[PDB]
C-alpha cells in the first residue's frame, strides 16, 4: 500500500525489435504430421502443454468450400428498392418441365412436413390458446441448482482444483452427468 509514485520508463534496446519465437519448416512438418498420429489413452493426463503455433498447425482438409459472399457483387440497394437494378432471377430455371417438377416436389415435402408437425405441435400448443387455456406458471423449486451464486461457487472450486472428481449416481449415471462442465 505504498503511496510513492514510481518512475515508469522503458529504456531503448534492440532486444525489443527482434524475433522472440521462430519455427523451421522441418519442425512445422514434424508437428503437423504428429498432430493426427496421437492415440490418446484414457489413463494419461496432461501435465504440461507444449507451446506451439497451433494456428499454423491446425490445418485440416475440407471437402466443401463456404458459400460465395453475394454482397460483394450485388448490394441491397441494387437487390431491392427505388434504385434496384435486378430485373431477372440470378439462377433461372432450366425449363418449364423442370420448374413444375421442382414445384410438385416442394408441395409434397411441404405437405409431409405439415403432417409431421400436425402430429405433435398443432394438437399441442396451438390448440390450447383458442379456448383461452394457458399452462400454469413453472414452479421456482425446479430451478434449484441453477442460481448464479451456486455457479459462482462451482467456478471458484474448479479454478482452485488440480483434480476434479465428477460424482455420478449409479442408478442414473448418464442422467447425472454435467457434460457442459466437462
Amino acid at each position: 500500500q505504498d503511496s510513492t509514485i514510481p518512475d515508469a520508463r522503458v529504456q531503448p534496446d534492440r532486444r525489443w525489435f527482434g524475433n522472440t519465437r521462430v519455427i523451421s519448416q522441418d519442425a512445422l512438418q514434424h508437428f503437423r504430421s504428429a498432430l493426427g498420429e496421437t492415440q490418446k489413452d484414457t489413463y494419461q493426463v496432461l501435465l504440461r502443454r507444449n507451446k506451439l503455433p497451433m494456428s499454423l498447425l491446425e490445418e485440416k482438409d475440407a471437402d466443401e468450400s463456404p458459400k460465395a459472399r453475394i454482397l460483394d457483387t450485388e448490394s441491397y440497394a441494387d437487390a431491392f428498392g427505388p434504385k434496384a437494378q435486378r430485373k431477372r432471377p440470378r439462377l433461372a430455371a432450366s425449363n418449364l418441365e423442370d420448374l413444375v417438377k421442382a414445384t410438385n416436389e416442394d408441395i409434397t415435402k411441404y405437405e409431409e412436413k405439415q403432417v409431421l408437425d400436425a402430429t405433435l405441435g398443432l394438437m399441442g400448443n396451438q390448440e390450447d390458446k383458442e379456448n383461452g387455456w394457458t399452462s400454469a406458471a413453472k414452479e421456482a423449486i425446479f430451478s434449484k441448482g441453477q442460481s448464479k451464486r451456486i455457479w459462482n461457487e462451482l467456478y471458484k472450486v474448479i479454478d482452485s482444483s488440480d483434480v476434479v472428481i465428477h460424482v455420478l449416481d449409479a442408478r442414473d449415471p448418464l442422467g447425472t452427468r454435467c457434460k457442459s462442465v466437462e
Partner: protein
C-alpha cells in the same frame, strides 16, 4: 387494398385541393421555423440541433467543392488491382502507478479485523496452466474477470490491426514485481503470437512470436490495445 393502392388512388382521384399551396407555404415557412428552433430549443435538444446544423453545413460545402472541382475539368499486378486492403519504444515514459492504486485491501475474519489479503485492480495475464492458490495461503488476488488472453495489435507497416493471443509479459514499466505478477498497464511490453501475420526471417524461419507495447488503459476501456515493435 393491394399493391400500390395509395399511388393508384392519387392517379385516379388526385390529392386534396389545397395540397400544392399548403406544401409550398410550409416550405416557404421552413426558414423562419429553422431560425426559431435554433433560438428556442434548449438543453440536449438544442445541442443536438446545433451539431446537426454544423454537419449539414459541412456536407453542403463539400458538395459545392466537389461540383466545382468536377466542372473545372502502388504498382500492383493485374490480379491484385481492383482489390483493396534508434531502438526507442513508442511510449518511453508513462504515468506512475503507486501500490495504493494498484492493490485493494481485502479484510477477513468475522469482525473484519485481519487485512493481509490484497486484490489487484488492474488487468492481468496469468498464463497457461494457472490454478488458484488455496484460500488460506492466497495473499495476492487476480480475479478471473480481469484476466486477459488476447489483444488488438496494430502493425506499423501495412497498417492493419489483428486480434492476437498473448504469450507472456516481458517488462511492466512500473516494477519487476508487477512484471512477474503479469499486470497489463499502459506501456507494458508483452509477447504476442504473430503466426497469422506471415512473417519469415531472412533465413527462411517462420516467425510466430514478437514483442508489442500496450498503448491504452485496459482498466479504463475494457480491452488491450498494443503496437507491434517492428
Amino acid at each position: 387494398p393491394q399493391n400500390d393502392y395509395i399511388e393508384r388512388h392519387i392517379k385516379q382521384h388526385g390529392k386534396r385541393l389545397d395540397h400544392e399551396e399548403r406544401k409550398r407555404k410550409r416550405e416557404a415557412r421552413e426558414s423562419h421555423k429553422i431560425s426559431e428552433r435554433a433560438q428556442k430549443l434548449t438543453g440536449w435538444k438544442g445541442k443536438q440541433f446545433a451539431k446537426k446544423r454544423y454537419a449539414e453545413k459541412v456536407s453542403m460545402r463539400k458538395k459545392i467543392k466537389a461540383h466545382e472541382q468536377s466542372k473545372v475539368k502502388d504498382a500492383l499486378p493485374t490480379y491484385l488491382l481492383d482489390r483493396e486492403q534508434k531502438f526507442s519504444v513508442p511510449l518511453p515514459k508513462v504515468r506512475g502507478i503507486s501500490e495504493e492504486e494498484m492493490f485493494k485491501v481485502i479484510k477477513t475474519g468475522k469482525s473484519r479485523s485481519k487485512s493481509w489479503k490484497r486484490m489487484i485492480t488492474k488487468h492481468t495475464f496469468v498464463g497457461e496452466g494457472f490454478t488458484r492458490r488455496p484460500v488460506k495461503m492466497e495473499r495476492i488476488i487476480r480475479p478471473s474477470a480481469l484476466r486477459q488472453k488476447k489483444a488488438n495489435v496494430t502493425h506499423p507497416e501495412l497498417g492493419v490491426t489483428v486480434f492476437l493471443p498473448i504469450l507472456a509479459v516481458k517488462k511492466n514499466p512500473q516494477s519487476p514485481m508487477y512484471t512477474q505478477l503479469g499486470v497489463l498497464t499502459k506501456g507494458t511490453i508483452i509477447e504476442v503470437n504473430v503466426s497469422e501475420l506471415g512473417m519469415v526471417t531472412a533465413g527462411g524461419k517462420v516467425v510466430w512470436g514478437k514483442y508489442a507495447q500496450v498503448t491504452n488503459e485496459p482498466d479504463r476501456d475494457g480491452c488491450v490495445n498494443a503496437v507491434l515493435l517492428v
